Design a protein around this ligand. Sequence first.
Ligand SMILES: [Zn+2]
Ligand SMILES: [Zn+2]
Ligand SMILES: [Zn+2]
Ligand SMILES: [Zn+2]
Ligand SMILES: [Zn+2]
Ligand SMILES: [Zn+2]
Ligand SMILES: [Zn+2]
Lengths: 213, 285, 242, 304
Amino acid sequence: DIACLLPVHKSLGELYILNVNDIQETCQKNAASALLVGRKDLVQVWSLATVATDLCLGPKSDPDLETPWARHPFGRQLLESLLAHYCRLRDVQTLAMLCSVFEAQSRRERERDQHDKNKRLLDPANTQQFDDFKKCYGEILYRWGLREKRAEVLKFVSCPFQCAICHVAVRGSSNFCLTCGHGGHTSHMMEWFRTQEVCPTGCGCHCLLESTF
Amino acid sequence: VINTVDTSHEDMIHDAQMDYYGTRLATCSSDRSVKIFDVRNGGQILIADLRGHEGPVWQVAWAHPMYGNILASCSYDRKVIIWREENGTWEKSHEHAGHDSSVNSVCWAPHDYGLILACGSSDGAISLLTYTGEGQWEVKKINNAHTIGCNAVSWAPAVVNYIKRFASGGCDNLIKLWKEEEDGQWKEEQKLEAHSDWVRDVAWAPSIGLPTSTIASCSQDGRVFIWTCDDASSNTWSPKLLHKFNDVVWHVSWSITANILAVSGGDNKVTLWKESVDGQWVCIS
Amino acid sequence: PEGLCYGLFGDLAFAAKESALSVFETGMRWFVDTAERYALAGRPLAELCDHNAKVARELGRNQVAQTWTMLRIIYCSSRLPPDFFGVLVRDMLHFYAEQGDVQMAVSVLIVLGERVRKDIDEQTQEHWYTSYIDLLQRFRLWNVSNEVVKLSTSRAVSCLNQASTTLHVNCSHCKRPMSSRGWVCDRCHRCASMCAVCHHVVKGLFVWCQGCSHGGHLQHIMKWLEGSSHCPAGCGHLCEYS
Amino acid sequence: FVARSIAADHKDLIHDVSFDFHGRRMATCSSDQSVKVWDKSESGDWHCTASWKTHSGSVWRVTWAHPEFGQVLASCSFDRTAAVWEEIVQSHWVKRTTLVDSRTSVTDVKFAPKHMGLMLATCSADGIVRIYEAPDVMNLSQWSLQHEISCKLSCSCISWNPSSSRAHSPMIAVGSDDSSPNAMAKVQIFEYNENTRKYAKAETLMTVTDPVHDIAFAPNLGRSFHILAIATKDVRIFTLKPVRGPTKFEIHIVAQFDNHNSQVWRVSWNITGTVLASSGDDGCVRLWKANYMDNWKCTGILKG
Ligand SMILES: [Zn+2]
Ligand SMILES: [Zn+2]
Ligand SMILES: [Zn+2]
Ligand SMILES: [Zn+2]
Ligand SMILES: [Zn+2]
Ligand SMILES: [Zn+2]
Ligand SMILES: [Zn+2]
């Protein structure tokens, strides 16, 4: 085991969370988890992200109202310096974490477009590198086994029938047997097949045996 | 921690590679057999003992789990065998005998490129076993890849459709980098020549998003180089002598983040190398 | 035939050919409040940063508040390099100075002290200090200007306060100079610093009329002149006429 | 902005209005040979606390001095004189010195910044810009002419560089309102050189060929480059960036506004040097401000 040699931590990957709705809370939990693991630099960086990703710093549409936080040296310049440092350290974990946290906040005409390009703490001319960071960290998470964490991280990448039980229209998640073709809501079959073994419509198909290949 | 594994082979081991998930370990030896152990929780469960080769097995290469439990093996008997696991057992799945000399190295392409396995034989021929479903494989052989014989093949990580590249190291004292054209034909693009002896193993560095392609190559004499390409457009590789070894260097392996290189040589010694802030690779072990 | 000029408080006088004098009044209230209610010394760096950030957030300057909190985290903390953020702090100071917000730059320089003082050259620091002092004096904020001068990281700005601010006092009875740290006459052996109101020795602050050469405790003379227009010592002098 | 009028009660057109250092006082000079000082109270009304005849001809410019030198006013007029007025306490204003060196009309008079001491610059219609100095700030009746600069063009406006930095040498710009058919630069910038102890022409703005009625250096206030505002048939703003003998500047024009559609007579910066007000023949005051992209825009149009 050489987990200490690598710049990434499996425990940090387990402990990191990524909620798009709330960024301050995720940054605070990430700082707490970094302190738990024992990375002082990660604690400092996550506290800096907590301060710099505040919702009251959202740029205004009109460029004449105020200077965007990205143009502030504690914005884009801060983020670029941190990304350069962890690229020197080759810390894919922290790079992807920062490029997701600072992207979730991001969620006449020529001047407006230039202002839109200048009001983002993540450089629009380098979105390919950030997406590569996120993809590499997702592959690392999949290698560890955290498929949920990999799917959570990959959501920040910029570039991408009636139930046989309840007899209600099924529009969301649904399970349909390949052999017979009767199904419905996922939770309904989850409850039904935990006890019974035949199709709930009485067709006699052993759906668990003939569908769960 | 240390999880020591007793191979129980009848001859010296030639390779040992665990799976992508890091749970199953497959080893190969001169005893014409490939053993796939289960090393979960520091255990030793002989899942299978695959014997289908008529000669010593040189290299084994697991495939990405996205395509299922697939293992590839190359052997001295001019024979490439692909083992796929199904119904809880490991069985021979595909058979390749397109090379007239010993197949030295097999390296699966990145899962983004699909299911492609590149084999390098001692006759100078490189074959790419592309997979198109329904259990048939198409072979796009790169004939006369090297003058004397190809010794190792390593793939380039998927970087941005997709441009497929891989690195080949042969007995002609040089490294050849290949890319496929638009039609599909694979054409040599840039030649690397810094080794004074046979190029035994070329290993690309996995990409983490950095705009820098790195190649670690070892040689028969004992020279290990680091081929960095700081500018993708320039496509100029500047070798940097990592270290001069008193004996032959056999294998070079990068980390997941491509920051530590596992240099193993003929002196029965394993050295771990990490790049310092000064740009000089310094041994850690 | 036209005249035009802004005032300090944002008001603008515009006199043109009919001539009609019009003052187009509005501005810098945030500057006044910010200068008045920061604390620049006497507390640890973290406490000063939180206080200044709370001030900036209360006044509506979110970016300034987050800058203060960021400085607190950067300085008042297998770790980051010790001088990792020095370039960024210098860039933040220059960014705030180049847009006219010299107040924020000077406040950060004073709060941080030597942590960033050795990184900014002396000439630019002096320029920022003088600009901020001029702004404060324009708004007639003498206390903040003097606090900045006292806490100034630059020796030249600190020496701006000690120029010709020492008073040479003499005993009237003896007409001879007194000691520089004294409250009793050297020759007459008399307590020449007696307050005209309370007849007690004025060791500290002494306020002195220039007409009758009489005075005493600052508070006592203030109260007496609030209650009367005569000299407390009784020399028939209306010191503060009407 | 909320507009309010003041009963000036001036017998002729008001030629210049200048606030004091603290912004609480005003000084207006008109063509009736009268200079009036206005002091506002807590009620907000401007009261004319002083009104005295000053010169023989029309008085063009009145300027304030830094309060450390006392309440001091300098007024230039058509009679080739630049008088210096001091206040002595009722509110009595006394003439200190009459500057009679100029052989022709003195178009503008401006006090130098505080860090230079008490220095005065006067520009005349014959192309001579004279820079005075008071060696003893307690004796304002004695002024010694330090330098005189020949500008080879009829001067109409001057503007000191208000930079208090030691990295910026003293700098005075001189604009000309001459309307000769030939196209020559109407703005010359002179920088004091310590080695020669003499003002030397540092930079010349060749792009400005129209007559210039007012120039105004922007208050430096922590910046590293110098911003100059020029009043002409349009409104031009130049940035003077010094490079690492007179200093060489990388002159770049960053604004050119014809929104007045007429001759612009006056330009005046604010205290922070961020908003510029221009008054043209249209009788409107247009406030110009620059965003973070250095794109100067109008933030308001103010009418009498
Ligand atoms: Zn249902
Ligand atoms: Zn069914
Ligand atoms: Zn079924
Ligand atoms: Zn005495
Ligand atoms: Zn007393
Ligand atoms: Zn008295
Ligand atoms: Zn008295």
